Amino acid sequence: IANQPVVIDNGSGVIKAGFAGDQIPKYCFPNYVGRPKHVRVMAGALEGDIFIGPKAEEHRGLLSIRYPMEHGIVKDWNDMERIWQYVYSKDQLQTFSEEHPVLLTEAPLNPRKNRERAAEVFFETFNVPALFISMQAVLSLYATGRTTGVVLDSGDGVTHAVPIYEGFAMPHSIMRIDIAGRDVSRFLRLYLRKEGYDFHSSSEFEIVKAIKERACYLSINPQKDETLETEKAQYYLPDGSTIEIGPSRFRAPELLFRPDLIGEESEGIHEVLVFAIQKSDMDLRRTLFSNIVLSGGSTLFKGFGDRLLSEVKKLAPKDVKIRISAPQERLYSTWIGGSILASLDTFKKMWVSKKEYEEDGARSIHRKTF
Amino acid sequence: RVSDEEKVRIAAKFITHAPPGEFNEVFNDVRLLLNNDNLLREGAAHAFAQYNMDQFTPVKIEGYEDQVLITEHGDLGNSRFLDPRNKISFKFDHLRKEASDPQPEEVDGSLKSWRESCDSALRAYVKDHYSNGFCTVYAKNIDGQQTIIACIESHQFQPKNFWNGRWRSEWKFTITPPTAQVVGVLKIQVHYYEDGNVQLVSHKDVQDSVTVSNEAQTAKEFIKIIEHAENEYQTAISENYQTMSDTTFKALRRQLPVTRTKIDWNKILSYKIGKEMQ
Amino acid sequence: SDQQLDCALDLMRRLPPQQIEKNLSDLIDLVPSLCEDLLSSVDQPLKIARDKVVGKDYLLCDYNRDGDSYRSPWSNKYDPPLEDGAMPSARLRKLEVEANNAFDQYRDLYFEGGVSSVYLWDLDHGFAGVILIKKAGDGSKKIKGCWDSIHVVEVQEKSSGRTAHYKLTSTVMLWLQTNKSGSGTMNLGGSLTRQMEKDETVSDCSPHIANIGRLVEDMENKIRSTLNEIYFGKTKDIVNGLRSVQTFADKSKQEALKNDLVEALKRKQ
Numbered sequence: 024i025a026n027q028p029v030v031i032d033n034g035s036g037v038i039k040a041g042f043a044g045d046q047i048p049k050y051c052f053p054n055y056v057g058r059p060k061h062v063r064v065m066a067g068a069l070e071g072d073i074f075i076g077p078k079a080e081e082h083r084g085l086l087s088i089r090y091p092m093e094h095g096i097v098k099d100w101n102d103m104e105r106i107w108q109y110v111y112s113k114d115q116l117q118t119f120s121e122e123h124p125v126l127l128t129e130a131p132l133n134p135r136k137n138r139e140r141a142a143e144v145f146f147e148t149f150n151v152p153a154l155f156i157s158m159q160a161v162l163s164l165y166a167t168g169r170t171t172g173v174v175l176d177s178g179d180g181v182t183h184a185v186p187i188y189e190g191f192a193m194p195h196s197i198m199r200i201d202i203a204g205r206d207v208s209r210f211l212r213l214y215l216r217k218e219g220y221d222f223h224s225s226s227e228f229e230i231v232k233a234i235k236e237r238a239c240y241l242s243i244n245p246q247k248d249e250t251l252e253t254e255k256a257q258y259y260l261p262d263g264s265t266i267e268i269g270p271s272r273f274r275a276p277e278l279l280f281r282p283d284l285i286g287e288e289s290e291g292i293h294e295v296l297v298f299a300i301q302k303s304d305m306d307l308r309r310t311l312f313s314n315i316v317l318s319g320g321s322t323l324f325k326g327f328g329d330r331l332l333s334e335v336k337k338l339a340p341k342d343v344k345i346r347i348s349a350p351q352e353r354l355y356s357t358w359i360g361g362s363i364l365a366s367l368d369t370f371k372k373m374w375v376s377k378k379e380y381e382e383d384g385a386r387s388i389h390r391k392t393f
Numbered sequence: 394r395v396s397d398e399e400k401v402r403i404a405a406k407f408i409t410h411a412p413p414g415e416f417n418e419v420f421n422d423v424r425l426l427l428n429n430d431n432l433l434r435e436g437a438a439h440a441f442a443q444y445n446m447d448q449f450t451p452v453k454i455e456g457y458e459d460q461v462l463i464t465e466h467g468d469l470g471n472s473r474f475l476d477p478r479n480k481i482s483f484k485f486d487h488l489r490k491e492a493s494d495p496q497p498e499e500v501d502g503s504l505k506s507w508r509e510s511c512d513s514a515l516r517a518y519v520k521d522h523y524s525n526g527f528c529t530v531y532a533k534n535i536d537g538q539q540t541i542i543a544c545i546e547s548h549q550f551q552p553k554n555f556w557n558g559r560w561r562s563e564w565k566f567t568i569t570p571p572t573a574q575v576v577g578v579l580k581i582q583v584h585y586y587e588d589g590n591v592q593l594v595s596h597k598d599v600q601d602s603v604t605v606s607n608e609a610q611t612a613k614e615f616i617k618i619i620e621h622a623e624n625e626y627q628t629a630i631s632e633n634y635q636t637m638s639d640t641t642f643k644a645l646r647r648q649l650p651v652t653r654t655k656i657d658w659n660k661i662l663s664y665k666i667g668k669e670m671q
Numbered sequence: 672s673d674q675q676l677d678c679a680l681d682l683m684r685r686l687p688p689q690q691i692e693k694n695l696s697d698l699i700d701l702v703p704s705l706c707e708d709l710l711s712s713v714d715q716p717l718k719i720a721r722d723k724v725v726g727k728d729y730l731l732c733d734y735n736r737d738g739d740s741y742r743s744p745w746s747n748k749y750d751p752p753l754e755d756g757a758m759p760s761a762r763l764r765k766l767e768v769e770a771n772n773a774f775d776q777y778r779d780l781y782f783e784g785g786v787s788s789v790y791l792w793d794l795d796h797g798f799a800g801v802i803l804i805k806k807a808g809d810g811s812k813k814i815k816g817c818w819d820s821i822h823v824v825e826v827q828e829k830s831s832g833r834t835a836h837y838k839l840t841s842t843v844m845l846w847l848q849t850n851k852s853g854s855g856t857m858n859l860g861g862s863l864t865r866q867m868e869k870d871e872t873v874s875d876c877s878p879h880i881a882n883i884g885r886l887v888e889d890m891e892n893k894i895r896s897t898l899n900e901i902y903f904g905k906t907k908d909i910v911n912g913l914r915s916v917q918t919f920a921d922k923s924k925q926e927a928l929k930n931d932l933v934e935a936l937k938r939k940q
């Protein structure tokens with residue numbers, strides 16, 4: 024146990040978690056595994072052959088990266104098991120499965136079977152007394168504090184805008200495209216190869232992802248940066264060498280506004296937002312213009328909301344009072360809200376009645392955790 | 394000079410094909426097109442009668458207040474309906490719910506006792522599980538076979554955003570001892586008209602057979618079968634919407650080019666891409 | 672008359688348009704005094720047109736029609752054969768052949784069938800025309816309908832500075848005659864109506880036709896999206912709302928505890 028459990032945020036690329044009652048997810052690390060590739064010549068050296076965490080973020084070009092969750096969907100379940108075990112570690116948990124009424128998140132629009140399999144793991148294998156899993160937006164409602172809102176959370180490999188009302192969103196006003204800067208950086212690398220730069224290796228591409236999170240802006244111009252050309256704002260490698268930029272510095276980040284140009288059946292961020300608004304009522308939209316919530320790391324862009332609002336102006340009807348809530352800790356805001364929910368004793372029927380839960384299964388899967 | 398007799402079939406077609414909710418208002422508009430009530434009522438009376446009998450038009454006597462539905466098993470033709478539960482004969486107007494003079498009739502009445510608990514459990518599930526879903530089970534001992542007549546109406550008519558929609562369905566448990574039959578037909582009529590036409594019409598009609606046991610077994614049996622079939626087909630409709638997005642649209646209007654990415658119009662304007670190679 | 676016209680508008684607004692001709696017959700046999708400009712307000716379906724001097728299919732519409740003689744863009748002729756061949760700009764006529772050619776390719780890209788016909792003319796500075804795409808529910812699928820893409824291209828072609836203006840009016844009829852066993856006897860559908868404008872400094876590499884294909888396609892996508900989202904989910908909203916598959920005696924208490932959580936939110940805010 025009756026102490027501080029853990030709030031666990033997902034992420035196809037970066038998973039997060041932390042002890043309740045705090046304001047920051049105590050442990051955050053990416054969603055992949057690092058396994059080396061060379062002969063164990065010198066005995067007694069770094070052995071174990073499976074790295075996650077500091078050694079993973081340390082021995083970059085010394086391992087083999089493998090993400091088990093794709094499009095927010097885990098397929099290499101065993102790798103996530105080991106990632107969970109990394110969370111269970113003495114560096115992180117120092118606990119057992121039978122010690123806390125832990126919390127976990129899950130984005131909507133997913134088959135229940137994923138959650139079912141996770142429940143099978145954390146209840147058949149792990150003897151967790153109570154493990155709740157909810158959506159990924161009420162958390163943000165707790166963070167913002169408001170009841171009426173339009174929650175947007177730029178995931179590791181997902182995007183989803185949903186308008187909620189007092190913690191009760193429509194089961195239809197749901198907009199989502201599993202996308203992020205991942206393929207953006209991939210296409211950026213494609214540009215680079217058609218500019219003389221191929222970074223096909225796993226970690227080699229992760230450095231490009233650092234560049235993604237480093238030199239990507241969002242201008243408001245339609246073709247000004249396209250007709251012009253930047254002078255390669257030269258940055259330098261951790262390796263210690265030249266890093267040009269090239270005019271294309273906006274082309275990959277500006278692509279998410281019109282991602283269908285890549286041969287995609289998507290709809291576009293602003294259109295996604297508009298459609299979420301369209302699926303709602305009428306008077307509520309008036310309030311929802313004044314209720315805009317942004318979350319995720321892919322929101323961290325130079326001129327992000329400006330071009331987004333320009334698209335809104337060119338698309339949404341009149342009498343709109345835009346109120347974008349885009350603070351710094353948009354990522355932690357989710358974990359913050361989860362910690363707030365974990366700070367509740369009124370969580371009674373929400374917490375899993377483990378024994379009876381296993382005796383029920385499917386029905387209890389559709390009943391207890393949501 | 395057009396013959397006004399044609400207008401009788403015109404307004405009759407208008408009455409019959411009118412979706413629920415969108416009937417009296419535009420019907421009055423049809424009168425405005427005709428400027429006469431007598432010419433209208435030349436065939437509009439019979440049209441009113443049958444159009445209400447089939448659309449499960451909601452009717453409610455004050456003596457029972459079960460919110461019965463306009464059909465043929467209570468009807469007498471003289472604007473006088475009968476209670477499918479306490480067999481009262483009572484006059485009932487049709488442009489409004491003006492009902493009077495309850496007269497409890499007499500028939501074999503055995504089946505009535507059966508449909509009492511049948512409609513009780515059925516109506517209990519339908520009320521506690523469908524918002525405006527409300528049923529009425531008529532009963533008739535025609536051709537030596539008892540008839541359980543389930544009529545379900547469900548609507549929400551608030552066209553403030555130019556929308557309407559109504560569910561109706563009739564399922565007959567033809568009690569033919571020993572093996573009774575599960576007969577039935579659905580009815581869907583939804584309509585939206587704020588900048589775009591939406592005319593949703595669908596149904597499903599099936600029949601099964603099983604031997605009569607008692608009242609409770611057959612009650613839960615028949616209602617459970619229809620219940621699951623309706624929920625099942627409702628799920629099928631949801632999946633039909635799923636089949637729309639991917640098949641139907643792309644079966645007619647595709648989303649992407651042959652290269653599935655973009656369209657260079659100037660490349661269409663010139664170059665002659667290789668239209669003479671093969 | 673006027674009030675009867677309003678009645679006819681609401682009538683057509685609520686009438687099932689699969690009987691447009693019979694409903695129009697009801698409209699004439701009911702009010703023949705207002706038989707003047709019936710199809711001006713009432714939306715019409717599309718009509719097949721096969722040329723004979725050329726031998727190629729085209730379409731039948733308003734502007735190609737001369738009284739009763741439709742213009743064949745294959746021969747640029749009025750059918751029944753008349754010497755009243757008022758034809759527009761021959762250069763633009765050939766450009767129209769190229770446009771309809773590109774759009775036939777376009778309909779073979781996104782539709783693979785039907786007929787496209789943008790019958791235009793040549794006004795003072797600009798002109799207009801109509802986009803016509805006839806593609807009903809193919810026999811290849813029991814799910815059918817009648818795809819009719821009628822759009823109005825309104826080019827307010829300016830002169831100074833190689834610029835021009837565009838204005839698109841739109842409507843696409845189609846039914847959903849999906850009568851499979853899993854669909855039962857499902858039928859839905861209709862048409863929309865939208866508009867948009869443009870003030871382009873029209874160069875030579877991107878002609879008016881390019882703008883047409885672009886924004887028209889964009890509009891179609893918006894329409895398709897609007898349909899798939901709003902109307903389908905809307906219908907399903909009404910379905911699950913009226914006929915639900917949700918057992919109560921639970922949602923009350925769970926939402927009550929959720930409101931207690933909101934109370935706790937107020938306890939800190």
Ligand SMILES: Nc1ncnc2c1ncn2[C@@H]1O[C@H](COP(=O)(O)OP(=O)(O)O)[C@@H](O)[C@H]1O
Pocket residue numbers: 032033034035036037038176177178179180181203204205235236237239318319320321322323324354
């Ligand atoms: N500083 C940054 N600049 C640009 N993009 C970023 C930055 N930080 C994170 N991102 C992008 O946003 C995503 C962060 O996702 P996150 O919200 O943690 O995922 P989830 O919600 O699925 O856990 C990553 O895919 C990353 O590329």
